[PDB]
Amino acid sequence: VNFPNIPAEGVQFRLRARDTGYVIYSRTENPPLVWQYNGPPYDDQLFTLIYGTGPRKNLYAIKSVPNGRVLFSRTSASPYVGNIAGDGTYNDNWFQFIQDDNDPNSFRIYNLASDTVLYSRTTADPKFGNFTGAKYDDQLWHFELV
C-alpha cells in the first residue's frame, strides 16, 4: 500500500529514519555524497518530490533543494545510493513510498528499477545504504515537514 501522507509536489521536507533518528543528506562535494547524519538542520537535508505521471504514476523523484540533484538507488555500480543531475532521467531515480505493514505512519523508500529499499542503522558498516531482501525496522522512514 502506498504511503497515504506523501508531501504535496514541491513541498520541502527531511527524510528521517524512524529508529535511528538520522536524516538523509545529499550534496555535490566530498564523498559520501549521499549518507546519513545525526545533528542540526542543514540545507542539504532538504528535499522536494517530483510526482511521476504516466508510466511513473505512484513513483517520485527525490530532489535536493540546495543542489537540485535527484537521488538514485542501484545495485549495478558503486556508490549504490547517490545523486545525479536532472529531474529523473534514469529509471533508478524513481521511488515508491510503501507504507509499513504494522506501522501506518512509516514507509519504505523503495526503488522499482533496482528492487531495493533504503536503510539507516547504528550497527555495522555500511551504516546507510540500500538493500534487497527481508523487511527490517531499520528500513522505516518519516517525512519531516519544514
Secondary structure (3-state) at 70: strand
Rule CB under 6 A: is residue 3 a binding residue for ligand GLA? no
From 13-21, 50-58, 90-98, 100-108, give the range in contact with ligand GLA by CB under 6 A. 90-98
Q: Which three cell numbers stand for residue 45?
A: 537535508
Choose between 23 and 71: whose C-beta lies nearer to its own copies: 71
Secondary structure (3-state) at 91: helix
Burial class (CB in 10 A: 0-12, 13-18, 19+), 140: buried
Residues present in the chain in total? 146
Rule CB under 6 A: is residue 138 a binding residue for ligand GLA? yes
Binding residue for ligand GLA, selected from 3, 72, 110, 128, defined by CB under 6 A: 72
**Residues in 26-55 that interact with ligand GLA by CB under 6 A:** 27, 37, 42, 44-45
Q: Which three cell numbers stand for residue 4?
A: 497515504
**Residues in 93-132 that interact with ligand GLA by CB under 6 A:** 93, 119, 121, 131
- Residues 114 and 97 sit within 8 Å (Cβ to Cβ): no
For residue 137, give the nearest of 96, 103, 98 by alpha carbon. 103
Residues contributing to the site for ligand GLA (CB under 6 A): 25, 27, 37, 42, 44-45, 72, 74, 84, 90, 92-93, 119, 121, 131, 136, 138-139
